[PDB]
Symmetry: D2
Subunit: 295 residues, 4 copies
């Protein structure tokens, strides 16, 4: 599964003022990511606003991304739903469109037993019909509190090739790297990318890579050579942005900056996400101009 | 509003062997409840397994239920989704089918601001076109922790006729009853129903009312007449069952009881809910045969 | 648990008075104890959370226990909160409580460091020993202690030989019923004053609380009202308690209580120990007005 | 005040407190430990903190430990006195004592159990700083045990109080570690969870303080070096080795695990912690003994 190792932008999903899918802007953002030199895309994840789309909408997005990008970079399809049957549909669709991998968040809202969780992944793994699975652990949003042992069982299920570990627990990262020396182990929290790598992540999947994905590859390069100053300097500039994005709202801030880069046309998230407070437009515009110059 | 006061069953959704909608068993369950003397039904809530269904399936359930109970008991439509747009679609359908009110859980998974929560409700109230809204607060599952002030604002929004309070905080129950003397206030945890009423709830919405809803009406009567011992005795019997349901899985325990009551053909929940452990079958059959003796 | 049946009722969690130098105010301690008695309280729970146990030395806690016993022994029931993180310290205070002739002892589940359930269980066995015959009251307050006990763990705790009661400062009234159902005769103190009527209805047969220092009769009233099947009076009385508790939460509960007792000529100096700060001056009118209200009543 | 305290930047053991079979202070085993620590090349000792079992000692006992440590270590290594109690007045007594005995710095955990306002926390620190009489203050943040959840802003106000020169940051949140370094470029920032030291340093900690340093503090000193050199590889091997040992120490119980290890290195005569802590489980002695030998 080492072919899946790298820095993958958690792709955003553009909408218009009607809240419909903006497929023109999706295609453009997909190409924008290819020309920044991204290693791959993680499609319809949290950052993709999965949980405010229908299965049909999620399918249309997968199909377009595979058209624009298949064979150009690696493609992981986030197919997770609370329902197993829905997650299976999305898996089957991912395979149809020629994706390289599937991924599913631990199903949320209702408490499920670990056995139920395991059967959920086995079931999706089947429907993906040979596509490797990227287990997605995001305790802060899912409310699902997996133990290291339980993580070990999931990552060794037949058909699992990777872990998207959106956890700030860098003790646990090491423990995972230690127990699974080959594992494609994505750091999920952008704001700690450099440190997660040191603990043992060998790439990442992140929302902010859509506007500065080079800085994160810049960090992967910086560390490989042992240039720690450049690594830290880059994470700081990344974190200056992450502070901003947190004030503004992260997905809608990211989409706003992409509006000013003429890549996205209507920087709206879907309701009940509201719009970016106008008071921030100046900083976002200016951040857009700043980043275009750097690329 | 005040015509929404009462003990309402959180209607389960029966599925057949292929995990599609069992229309037959749904209809029987609706009538089973009507017979038990329940005051109303709350349809396509957490208990109805709404979050593992498609909008169309939710619309179809609301239709079948309204066909069989409209005019005979009160009918509340839980239309809530993460997406506002999806919630507004279900509300508009609840209107068409002739439901007496609609309800929405606070939108979950993504962090939303309180003001975004407010707009969400306003938007769904609009689309509901005269049906009053029942705010549904379930912090243990939603992750949305409302302060008393935020609740006060939500429950005074134009068109809000009640609050379904699935919280064990009976200070906050009392505080809401004190601040809003006329508010329909449903106790949401079955296992504290008697105390919830004592704290200021004047009714309740619950999943266990499906198999023993006369017991909850009995607790109401007894408090109304000063039979505190009788109230406590009934709550104890309710909790003896809830103890079992928690060990078996509440929804699938309930359906299984109901299968042994000749109401549910196949007592299955949707994956990733697993089946009921076979070791609990002797206990659950006993419990339904005992409940059939009772009324 | 029939052995501790006589421990049943409504006990004030006694506040510990201090002066402007943060030393114990022993004259105001005696006044506060006599006030609780002239009030009609069933008993006092001495040196607990409300009594600022955790910002006092063992010597200070002992000094306060001795004085309460002097003032109150044989007149009302006396429960000594002897709990510390350390078992040895808890044991010292246990022995002291016994020297002063207390009716019971009590200990919070030891906090800060994580301890195993087995480490907890022993802790209570070692204090029950030193209590030298005084019944024990397990004190469960997960919101402050960070100790998260299962129902099964609690069941074991509350059936250790020597245990005669549970002070349950938890708002989980499912669990309250479960503990009562399992223990028909267990003395079960409701700990969160703001849900007292609800707690009794769920299984509680009494309670220990901080606000009983200023309005204990109302809690006795809820108890009486529920026993004779008068829901409307219990609700009314609980609402009245809750309006005051709203205020106390805005002011700080301990220092607000002390301030009310100060306007009532009971407590010379209404200060808690640092790092508690003073009451915000903007709240003094409300607090004075409540003192007059409650004295009138 | 950050510029003034830069001498406190380094790696420093959180000292355990040996106890005899009667649970009283084992003064002999205590003196050895200061030596056993000093010979590892430790940059300092954080005395009477969590790992020093501060919260099951009396004030006199804590003062006695601080005194007997200052005898041995004053002049040789840095000496931080953790003087924190729930009570401000008690914390002030220990602060005064730490200054009499000639400690380099004091420290206090955010006061716990009772909910205190942020203004209350600030006044608490000010008061102890007054009593410290010129000794720099090391604010000690441990949300997992203390239950005190300060926002970034609150931390910023806290660490810029007059007299504050450092922060012991027992938190696994390495975004906040970076952010704090970014707000305070000259603040001494001690990584608090040993299991992420290497990662903490990368995020901005310019040193640390820890409990496992007692039995293997040379391993943590090796990491600082590798990162300054720009040698990422060895920094990971060492950090991996620390976590192999942390894994077992969590299984047995960390303080008593460590003390049982030291009992096998003949540093500590009776490897007990105070009740309610219990003895190590018997089944674990083979591995602990084995680990003591491996480390010697
Ligand atoms: Na049937």
């Amino acid at each position: 599964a080492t072919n899946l190792r790298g820095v993958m932008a958690a792709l955003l999903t553009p909408f218009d003022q009607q809240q419909a899918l903006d497929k023109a802007s999706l295609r453009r953002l997909v190409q924008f990511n290819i020309q920044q030199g991204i290693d791959g895309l993680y499609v319809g994840g949290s950052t993709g606003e999965a949980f405010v789309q229908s299965l049909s909408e999620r399918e249309q997005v997968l199909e377009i991304v595979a058209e624009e990008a298949k064979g150009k970079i690696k493609l992981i399809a986030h197919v997770g739903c609370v329902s197993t049957a829905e997650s299976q549909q999305l898996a089957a669709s991912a395979k149809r469109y020629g994706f390289d991998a599937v991924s599913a968040v631990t199903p949320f809202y209702y408490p499920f037993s670990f056995e139920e969780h395991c059967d959920h992944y086995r079931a999706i793994i089947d429907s993906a019909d040979g596509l490797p699975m990227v287990v997605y652990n995001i305790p802060a949003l899912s409310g699902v509190k997996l133990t290291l042992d339980q993580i070990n069982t999931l990552v060794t299920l037949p058909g699992v090739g990777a872990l998207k570990q959106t956890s700030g627990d860098l003790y646990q990262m090491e423990q995972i790297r230690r127990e699974h020396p080959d594992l494609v182990l994505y750091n999920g929290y952008d704001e700690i990318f450099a440190s997660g790598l040191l603990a043992g992540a060998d790439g990442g999947i992140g929302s902010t890579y859509n506007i500065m994905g080079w800085r994160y590859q810049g960090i992967v390069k910086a560390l490989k050579e042992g240039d720690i100053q450049t690594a830290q300097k880059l994470q700081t500039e990344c974190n200056k942005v992450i502070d901003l994005l947190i004030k503004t709202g992260v997905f809608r801030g990211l989409k706003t900056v992409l509006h000013y880069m003429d890549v996205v046309s209507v920087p709206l998230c879907r309701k009940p996400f509201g719009p970016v407070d106008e008071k921030y437009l100046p900083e976002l515009k200016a951040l857009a101009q700043q980043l275009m110059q750097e690329r």
